[PDB]
């Protein structure tokens, strides 16, 4: 998916060409690097003007802190946000799918595969260090569960019990569960 596609007058790269139209393709699992690039892109796109930012996600997973940073940047910008799911949204990608446009602007392709699970993490040290890290990670689970529950409309206690293991969904299950809002078809 490299070839620069022609723009208004010149040859510009495919992903830069997309962002010229506010479209932000996220295609890699969210590591520090991709998250920083997408946070920067979101901030600059909101800088140009305020129309709307569509995020097309193919995320197969990712790390928790960078994903929450990207979420907070999406919420901070003036322009609204819509998230479409081309391919699949797993874990923190399935959390980003519930990060933009609560009012009926989450779409998914018909065979997109959706998955949510409680955020992972790992850290060791002293005893007290493990206390501090464990308390922080429990705070993180609770925050992401509050966000998931207020995004989908499911009870907080239900979400806690559901996401402890992996949770997989077809787009029909995702509409019925409240994860997304519409499924893209030929139109």
């Amino acid at each position: 998916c490299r070839p620069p596609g022609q723009r208004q007058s010149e040859w510009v790269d495919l992903w830069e060409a997309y962002t010229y139209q506010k479209v932000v393709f996220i295609k890699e699992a969210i590591t520090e690097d991709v998250a920083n690039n997408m946070i920067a892109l979101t901030l600059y796109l909101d800088s140009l003007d305020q129309k709307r930012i569509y995020y097309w996600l193919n995320v197969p997973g990712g790390d928790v802190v960078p994903t929450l940073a990207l979420y907070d940047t999406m919420q901070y910008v003036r322009s609204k946000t819509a998230t479409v799911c081309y391919g699949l949204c797993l874990g923190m990608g399935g959390f980003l799918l519930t990060a933009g446009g609560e009012k009926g602007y989450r779409f998914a392709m018909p065979h997109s595969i959706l998955m949510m699970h409680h955020p992972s993490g790992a850290s060791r040290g002293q005893a007290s260090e493990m206390h501090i890290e464990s308390r922080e990670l429990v705070r993180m689970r609770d925050y992401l569960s509050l966000l998931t529950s207020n995004a989908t409309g499911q009870p907080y206690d239900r979400v806690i019990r559901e996401l402890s293991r992996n949770k997989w969904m077809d787009p029909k299950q995702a509409i019925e569960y409240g994860m997304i809002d519409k499924v893209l078809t030929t139109p």
Binding site: I39, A40, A69, Q75, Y76, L146
Partner: protein, 233 residues
């Protein structure tokens, strides 16, 4: 003079360029978003010199940094943060520098969070501002280095305390007593301490209360030895 020519640079030179870095530098936005290191410090100094030379117009500084590195990976030095901080303090009298914390700002970046022009210094409500335990995960010295090493680490730790009191208007004794364990503030606690001037609440709030999870059942009957069920929330 130079306002119309920032305009002209936009017209001819700074509109076409593809790199997101170039577009951001056109928008006077400096995104510190990576363990701050030697290369990062030199880049930020170059950017900030050129941004001064463009105009006395303001600068936006977004900070999503995990300190000089994560505690599970090799650290750098504390001198990159001091270099960037001194450059920012020198710049500020001739150019406003809004400093905004998206995500996280651990230790060194916290200084870079507090080094924005007073009254224009903000962190998102969902951020964390960590004055973390001091410091240096580099452990590759010998005993032949001991005679120097103390006179470095204090030399570094105390330097930071000083700079932090020149950003929070506090007593360095408090900052020294607070270093001893990583103490990470909420945005409101940060404004109380002086690290930031405002807190950026979102336009809309999502997360609600979860206190409806509390049980509230009666105290256990004195004649009911509870079993060993160890549950999870």
């Amino acid at each position: 003079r130079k306002l119309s020519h920032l305009r002209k640079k936009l017209w001819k030179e700074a509109g076409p360029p593809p790199d997101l870095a170039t577009r951001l530098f056109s928008e006077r936005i400096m995104y510190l978003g990576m363990p701050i290191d030697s290369s990062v410090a030199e880049l930020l100094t170059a950017q900030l010199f050129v941004l001064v030379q463009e105009a006395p117009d303001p600068i936006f500084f977004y900070i999503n940094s995990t300190g000089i590195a994560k505690s599970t990976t090799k650290f750098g030095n504390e001198h990159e943060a001091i270099a960037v901080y001194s450059m920012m303090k020198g710049v500020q009298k001739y150019c406003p520098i809004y400093t905004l914390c998206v995500g996280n700002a651990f230790g060194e970046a916290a200084l870079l969070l507090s080094a924005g022009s007073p009254g224009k210094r903000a962190a998102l409500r969902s951020s964390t501002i960590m004055l973390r335990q001091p410091l240096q995960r580099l452990g590759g010295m010998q005993a032949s280095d001991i005679d120097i090493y103390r006179k470095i680490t204090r030399e570094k730790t105390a330097t930071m305390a000083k700079y932090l009191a020149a950003c929070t208007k506090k007593t360095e004794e408090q900052i020294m007593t607070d270093f001893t364990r990583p103490r990470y503030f909420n945005p409101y606690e940060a404004v109380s301490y002086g690290l930031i001037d405002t807190v950026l609440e979102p336009k809309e709030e999502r997360a609600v209360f979860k206190d409806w999870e509390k049980m509230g059942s009666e105290i256990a009957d004195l004649g009911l030895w509870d079993d060993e069920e160890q549950p999870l929330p």
